[PDB]
Each structure stands twice: as structure tokens, then as C-alpha cells.
Design a protein around this ligand. Structure first.
Ligand SMILES: Cc1nn(Cc2c(C)noc2C)c(=O)s1
Length: 171
């Protein structure tokens, strides 16, 4: 049985208890904290690619109103996010298992781009998700895993100064 763990769950949970926020820019902004995943149970000799996407956790626009995030009442279906390929992809199971898989180079944007950067909708809530794709082998296989601890609202600037303080304290 293939095992997937969040590294530094302690810290992510401090952000989640405040409602996490991630900056989006036209050119793309790197995440803090960085999603780092512990993986065991891969075939050391098999080939895998690590993919990252962002599920829209609900169909609502969120607004920071008198110091609290509150959802709107005009839900729209959410067009699914594009996939980011970990730049170490494709690689042997042994490569992926020798240290946490760190998505330090994904950039979150609010504008459709030349590629690389992942476009999110500002003021929408997202749940990071990975896909571990066994490639090249006879049988293709996909194992997917969500990280509720890493949920955030995409923002063009921080609304909650308690998030601003935590981002600086731990970066
Ligand atoms: C409401 C509040 N807004 N701010 C401004 C602010 C600073 C400074 N950094 O992030 C934010 C957000 C407070 O300090 S209470």
C-alpha cells in the first residue's frame, strides 16, 4: 500500500486555524508554506511523475468582512485548475522516496499565462491535491491525494494581518 504524508503539518495547521491565504499575481507568486510530501511504498526502480493541482473547495466567492471570511450567495461552477508537473518528473521511485517532494517552484497567478504558472480565481477557496503517475511501465497507474490542512483562499493581497504575521515569522 503506497503511503502519502504532509511534511510540516504542525505549521500548515497554524495557518489553517486562521484561514490560510496565498497571493496570486499576473506573473505568478510562489507558495509559503511550500507543499512538501513524504512518500513511501513506491517501486524504487519504477518511473513516476508528481503532479499538483488545486481543487475549488466550493463554488463561492469569499470576502473578508469585519475581520472574518464569509462566502457569497452567487455560486458558479468552478472550471478545474491546470496541473503543475514537479520539475524532477519523470523520475525513479527511489528519487521521490529519498527526501520530501517539495513543490517550491509552482507559481500561483490570477492571469492566463505562457505556461508553468497555475491560474486560480482570486477570493476562491482551494484544496491542494497531488497525482502520482506511474509512467513508462506496462500498466499506467495514478494515486491521488488531497491535503485539507493546506486549504487556502487565493488573494491579490493579505486580508488577515494574523496570516501576514505567520508568513513572515516562519519564512
Ligand atoms: C484589518 C487589519 N488590516 N491590517 C493591515 C495589514 C498589515 C499591516 N499586514 O497585513 C494586513 C492585512 C491590520 O494590521 S488589522
Amino acid at each position: 500500500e503506497l503511503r502519502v504524508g504532509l511534511e510540516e503539518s504542525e505549521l500548515w495547521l497554524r495557518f489553517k486555524e486562521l484561514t490560510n491565504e496565498m497571493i496570486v499575481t499576473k506573473n505568478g507568486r510562489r507558495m509559503f508554506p511550500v507543499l512538501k510530501v513524504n512518500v513511501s511504498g513506491l517501486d524504487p526502480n519504477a518511473m513516476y511523475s508528481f503532479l499538483l493541482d488545486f481543487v475549488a473547495a466550493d463554488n463561492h466567492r469569499w470576502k473578508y468582512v469585519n475581520g472574518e471570511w464569509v462566502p457569497g450567495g452567487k455560486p458558479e461552477p468552478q472550471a478545474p485548475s491546470c496541473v503543475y508537473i514537479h520539475p524532477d518528473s519523470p523520475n525513479f521511485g527511489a528519487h521521490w522516496m529519498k527526501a520530501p517532494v517539495s513543490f517550491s517552484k509552482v507559481k500561483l497567478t490570477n492571469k492566463l499565462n505562457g505556461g508553468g504558472q497555475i491560474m486560480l480565481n482570486s477570493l476562491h477557496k482551494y484544496e491542494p491535491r497531488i497525482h502520482i503517475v506511474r509512467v513508462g511501465g506496462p500498466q499506467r497507474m495514478i494515486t491521488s491525494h488531497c491535503f485539507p490542512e493546506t486549504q487556502f483562499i487565493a488573494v491579490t493581497a493579505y486580508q488577515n494581518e494574523e496570516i501576514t504575521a505567520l508568513k513572515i515569522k516562519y519564512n
